[PDB]
Design a protein around this ligand. Structure first.
Ligand SMILES: Cc1cc2nc3c(=O)[nH]c(=O)nc-3n(C[C@H](O)[C@H](O)[C@H](O)COP(=O)(O)OP(=O)(O)OC[C@H]3O[C@@H](n4cnc5c(N)ncnc54)[C@H](O)[C@@H]3O)c2cc1C
Ligand SMILES: Cc1cc2nc3c(=O)[nH]c(=O)nc-3n(C[C@H](O)[C@H](O)[C@H](O)COP(=O)(O)OP(=O)(O)OC[C@H]3O[C@@H](n4cnc5c(N)ncnc54)[C@H](O)[C@@H]3O)c2cc1C
Lengths: 458, 458
């Protein structure tokens, strides 16, 4: 319960919409993508402008309210909603300005990937981001951001040229390579630790149609397929991206009925470049095993972005355990296949991703993002509907991770689950974590922004 | 040259960006999708809120500035930019609020379709809109709006429940079936004639993955493909949509190279419903000729929306002639094939669309959209790059229209070209036009909003 004068100053300054626990849309406004997170904020402030975010940060600081910031609400740790605090909700700040001649996009901090991609593709332009359209740009970029265009053009942060950011003191700063470069280093991988980003500026690239393929392999052939994949990606051109999703086969017409619901490897691949070269490149990796349900298409980049994932179903409840690998040993390969064979929910995926390429050619210390030199990512992404089955699916992800943990290092902060606060130092490493703390001490000394993979100051 | 106190009142009330002819970004900001339209506004006002729009509409009325209103900039007539007037540019008002429980979306007037579909598809929901993601939602909906979901769920306006609209006098109104219903009737098909819509409210539908097919037929087999189409679509269930696009075959690896750049029928089809039924239904319509470069996929609806058109090239210069047909005779089929054989630009399409279904079940006078009872639309959509070639592409469109004029009636206001201001009466018909003139006399009696398929008051 709040100070009336502080609240009245807030209401007069704030031009967005405020949602209170008694309002009709409070229950839908406080849900985030991870539906296991059920929390009740004192206030949700739907900002519509940078002055709105200023007023909301300042109101929160003066009132002592625990601050959650929300872009697209996809935090796998549930950081975008809080008990008893204020949600600074950016979802209505979804505007993008694209300059075709300059190959530049300026995107507000609340954009969804699909809105961003629609705007840039109006000019046949693009820049790297994640693979599911309704993910928020904000959290994704601040953690690094990888997807289809990343082996060719780097992480999202490798194309970021500046931000507008509201800091804990209510100030509005620009951070770039020429202005507050210490803060600009930190926001490229350091998350929401340093303030609320209200606008991102990106360099764009011309991206025409891309040759794309998706197919399914039986777990029978898993050893030969995963070994073909890790061997080929070690020397693959930047232009090829190839990812493996172990999952239950979806009940789709392109798959034989006897495969529906059983563990398979879903392989998805694309060529960023000439589609005829892409057709030759993909044809040579599609037959590592017998391809079932093969879909080949020459897609506009916006449609590639909208494709993931097959079955198009939004799960209510999720739990993720992830790490990087420097090498994918045969022992790690067998472990991945044994646990994939035990997947229970049709929405769970054991993801095997290969980064590298342009991501790995950026010097390690040039941004806050850790583990550019590890090309493999494995993600035990459990997802289900029924809340009484939480233990089944959570246990699957935990046991898989534990059996792999010796082969893993680091961790992508954007794949951390609600119980992985203690993983922050191991994810960043000692040198980056220490540098991040010094930037935290300068820009957020009270740790007002602590609903994130948190960096304590000093 | 403007009255300096009306100017300063406006700038004080306006919290958005103003672009003047001397500013560096003026030339990029004044371009619209139809690059044959080259106009120089006195002022571009980039609105960020409904009060911004109120200030701009009032400033234009007080100053006598000619008003262009801009959503997504896709006017085939060039109406979203003006010489010497003001552009009320809505492109930054791109926010969408979605209720999963109530299956409702509220979208601002500047949204692009792809941003809208991303936000609704985050909940596996959708509502009918156009087929190209970067089209503006504003002008599309005010004209009617049809696309992949229309045979199943109707026009965009058929799912619209209310608008917030800024009228010529500067007031903000709600318009619905229970509040200002004469205005609500008129904005569902009447264009921007009655004010600036700053928010649309839509009913949503659950749309999971849809089975989709695109393929290409030789003109050799042209007559039997088009007759199969027009025969099948007369009795096809609502769940099937099947459209034909006669064009030069794009140079894509799924097509043999000997077909590249030569006239073909591009056939695109989808089933809105169970994908296994969809696979049977599409296969039953795919083989009236030999299908070259066949792509079949089970796509999330958002990826279907992002798919058009194959080759993903944005043309610089366009010219369109369109009308409705009540029937497609063999004689008209021959004319369409003859004219398609003469297509010169790789970006031109002679489109043959079939609406009907749920569109035709809405009583004719329920909205201002005309010609629900004509199921065929043909669109001679010329598009090219080289400005020295305008005459030839323009001529193709008009010669083709004139050769089909015995079969064509009415006309979609959203497909009309810059020289077609005279066609407004024929498009709506005398009775609808008369009623529209009465709503205009009430809400825009000075015809402040005249850059549209214009309806003069009285
Ligand atoms: C279905 C799905 C697919 C994904 N795919 C990918 C992928 O392909 N690649 C990838 O790299 N990641 C991917 N992710 C992970 C994604 O990067 C993270 O979940 C990210 O945190 C999501 O950001 P958000 O704004 O949507 O989330 P939120 O829950 O809104 O926010 C996440 C964190 O960022 C902070 N934050 C958000 N916006 C801002 C802002 N404007 N300013 C300051 N702080 C902010 C929040 O405080 C919180 O700490 C995926 C996640 C999901 C659920
Ligand atoms: C590539 C392409 C694909 C298309 N596909 C389809 C399709 O599948 N189906 C279909 O039905 N049509 C389609 N169209 C046509 C489309 O409906 C019209 O071009 C429409 O006018 C585009 O709206 P806009 O806001 O993008 O255009 P703009 O140029 O911004 O505006 C068009 C008109 O509407 C007015 N206007 C725009 N927004 C508002 C608003 N918020 N309030 C008041 N007036 C407003 C403008 O004053 C102008 O008169 C397509 C067009 C293109 C170029």
């Amino acid at each position: 319960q709040l100070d009336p004068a502080t609240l009245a100053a807030f209401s007069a300054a704030f031009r967005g919409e405020l949602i209170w626990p008694s309002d009709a849309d409070y229950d839908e406004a406080r849900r985030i993508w991870n539906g296991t997170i059920d929390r009740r904020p004192a206030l949700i402030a739907r900002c519509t402008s940078t002055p709105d975010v200023v007023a909301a940060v300042s109101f929160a600081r003066k009132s002592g309210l625990l601050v959650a910031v929300r872009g697209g609400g996809h935090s796998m740790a549930g950081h975008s909603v809080c008990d008893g605090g204020i949600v600074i909700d950016l979802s209505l700040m979804n505007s993008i300005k694209v300059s075709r001649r300059l190959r530049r996009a300026r995107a507000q901090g609340g954009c969804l990937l699909g809105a961003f991609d629609t705007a840039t593709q109006a000019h046949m332009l693009a820049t790297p981001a994640g693979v599911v359209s309704h993910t928020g740009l904000g959290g994704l970029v601040l953690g690094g951001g990888f997807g289809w265009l990343s082996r060719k053009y780097g992480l999202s942060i490798d194309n970021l040229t500046s931000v507008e950011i509201v800091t804990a003191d209510g100030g509005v700063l620009t951070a770039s390579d020429t202005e507050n470069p210490d803060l600009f280093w930190a926001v490229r991988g350091g998350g929401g630790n340093f303030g609320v980003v209200t606008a991102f500026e990106f360099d764009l690239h011309r991206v025409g149609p891309v040759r794309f393929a998706s197919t399914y392999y039986s777990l029978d052939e898993g050893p030969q397929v995963i070994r073909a994949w890790r061997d080929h990606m070690a020397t693959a051109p930047d232009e090829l991206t190839w990812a493996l999703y172990l999952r239950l086969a979806p009940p789709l017409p392109e798959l034989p009925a006897d495969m529906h619901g059983k563990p398979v490897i879903c392989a998805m691949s694309c060529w960023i470049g000439d589609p005829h070269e892409g057709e030759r490149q993909l044809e040579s990796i599609l037959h590592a095993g017998k391809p079932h349900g093969l879909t080949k298409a020459t897609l506009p980049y916006r449609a590639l972005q909208a494709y993931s994932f097959p079955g198009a179903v939004v799960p209510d409840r999720i739990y993720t355990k992830s790490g990087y690998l420097n090498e994918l040993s045969d022992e790690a390969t067998d472990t991945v296949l044994e646990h994939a064979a035990d997947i229970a929910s049709p929405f769970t995926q054991l993801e095997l991703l290969y980064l590298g390429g342009a991501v790995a050619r950026v010097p390690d210390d040039a941004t806050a993002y850790p583990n550019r030199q590890s090309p493999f990512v494995t993600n035990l992404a459990a997802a289900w509907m029924d809340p009484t089955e939480d233990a089944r699916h959570t246990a699957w992800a935990r046991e898989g991770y534990r059996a792999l943990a010796g082969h893993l290092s680091g961790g992508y902060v954007n794949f951390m689950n609600p119980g992985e606060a203690d993983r922050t130092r191991e994810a960043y490493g000692a040198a980056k974590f220490e540098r991040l703390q010094g930037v935290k001490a300068k820009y957020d000394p009270t740790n007002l922004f602590r609903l994130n993979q948190n960096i304590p100051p000093s």
